[PDB]
């Protein structure tokens, strides 16, 4: 098979910045009609990959000129001068010089100034009651950088089983992150207690998050 | 503007087969050569099967790890490509795109894809309750509602708010399997004036049960 070795892997970028992603092969890439057919894709958050550059470094139609490619030898580049909010996403780079074959990918990752993040929680609903269990939901909102943690205190002492937090993708607007933590007690549990309260955590503060409902 | 569309994906049992369905539309269906790529959360993109023009005689090109599996078929009247697939093993598991190969020797248009999961499991109906708050102060931007889809399978399901006519300030975080349960969230802020005023509901759609969903969160 034609081996391709994407680097890196992740890659964050200020606005404005270069970005550079390289994309080589296991073996020699030239067509006998002499045309090296190496092309790179763009597939954005929840998207289909796009077609960015076709013949080492030609562009495809609508592509800014912002986006240039290059070979040589194995090794072939990708680089994304001025770089921008819309421009995140996995890039991949494929062959179709041979049994066509794609590249790992690299995720462009915009890089922006912290933010902090708004929270918001969310006591169970009679209508998940009957299913014999109880879920509270902490979500933070609009947040810069990716990471930070959270923790979920029930009538003070704090709770760390029933969790489970998942992020969203970095939006493409203001390259911000959220996030839920969700907290699943079972029926009888959530019931036996009356304080429930989540506290964040994250780089723009040192005082914790503090957010909660009695029921 | 090009389009391109798949579709008839869902669960299948280790064993048995499906067809996927391709329409294109802006382009000379004929004058091209169709694609069918999958993408699975470990062998990353890969390609399976290549069709051809009249002229090219109608041959095919089985990525090896297909041949005799999957079959790629077209009718140009209709404008579509089909692939059968017969003897889905796990592995067969992954998104599916159709694509073109265009002059420039590349696919260049594709399609938004499919899912398709070959497993012993069985479908499960996604379960929607109701995010909304938690009786507090306004301290927040202005007011977030949402739906918590829980316990279903497999992948995906996709949410959309009002229709869809509501993609400002729309936030979705990723599944998380467990239990055997893939579950997600999502959450969409609004003027705490336009509301209850207004009318806000969800749409979550679970393809693998043919089941779209339309729920709306209210003052409790």
């Known amino acids: 098979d034609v081996v391709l070795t994407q680097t890196p892997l992740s890659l964050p970028v200020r606005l404005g910045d270069q970005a550079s992603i390289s994309c080589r092969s296991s073996?020699?890439?030239?067509?006998?009609?002499?045309?090296?057919?190496l092309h790179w894709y763009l597939q954005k958050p929840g998207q289909s990959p796009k077609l960015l550059i076709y013949?080492?470094?030609n562009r495809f139609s609508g592509v800014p000129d912002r986006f240039s490619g290059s070979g040589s030898g194995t090794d072939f580049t990708l680089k994304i001068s001025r770089v921008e909010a819309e421009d995140l996403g996995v890039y991949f780079c494929?062959?179709?010089?041979?049994?066509?074959?794609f590249g790992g990918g690299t995720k462009l990752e915009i890089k922006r100034a912290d933010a902090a993040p708004t929270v918001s929680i969310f006591p169970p609903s009679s209508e998940q009651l009957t299913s014999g269990g109880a879920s509270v939901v902490c979500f933070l909102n609009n947040f810069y950088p990716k990471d930070i943690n959270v923790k979920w205190k029930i009538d003070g002492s704090e709770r760390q089983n029933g969790v489970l937090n998942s992020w969203t993708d970095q939006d493409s607007k203001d390259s911000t992150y959220s996030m839920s933590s969700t907290l699943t007690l079972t029926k009888d549990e959530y019931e036996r207690h009356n304080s429930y309260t989540c506290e964040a955590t994250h780089k723009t503060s040192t005082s914790p998050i503090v957010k909660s409902f009695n029921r | 503007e090009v389009k391109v569309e798949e579709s008839g994906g869902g669960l299948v049992q280790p064993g048995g087969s499906m067809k996927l369905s391709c329409v294109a539309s802006?382009?000379?269906?004929?004058?091209?050569?169709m694609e069918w790529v999958r993408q699975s959360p470990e062998k990353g993109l890969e390609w399976v099967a290549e069709?051809?023009?009249?002229?090219?005689?109608?041959?095919?090109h089985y990525a090896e790890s297909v041949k005799g599996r999957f079959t790629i078929s077209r009718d140009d009247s209709k404008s579509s490509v089909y692939l059968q697939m017969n003897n889905l093993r796990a592995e067969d598991t992954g998104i599916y795109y159709c694509?073109?190969?265009?002059?420039?020797?590349?696919?260049?248009?594709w399609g938004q894809g499919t899912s398709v999961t070959v497993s012993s499991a069985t479908t499960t109906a996604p379960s929607v309750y109701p995010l909304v708050p938690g009786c507090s102060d306004t301290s927040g931007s202005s007011v977030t509602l949402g739906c918590l889809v829980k316990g279903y399978f497999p992948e995906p399901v996709t949410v959309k708010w009002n229709y869809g006519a509501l993609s400002s300030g729309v936030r979705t975080v990723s599944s998380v399997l467990q239990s055997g349960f893939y579950s997600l969230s999502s959450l969409v802020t609004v003027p705490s004036s336009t509301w209850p005023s207004q009318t806000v509901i969800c749409n979550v759609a679970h393809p693998a049960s043919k089941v779209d969903l339309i729920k709306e969160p209210s003052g409790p």
């Open positions: 694509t073109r190969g265009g002059a420039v020797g590349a696919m260049d248009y």
């Open positions: 802006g382009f000379t269906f004929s004058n091209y050569w």
């Open positions: 069709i051809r023009l009249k002229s090219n005689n109608y041959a095919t």
């Open positions: 073996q020699s890439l030239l067509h006998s009609d002499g045309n090296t057919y």
């Open positions: 013949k080492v470094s």
């Open positions: 494929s062959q179709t010089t041979h049994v066509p074959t």
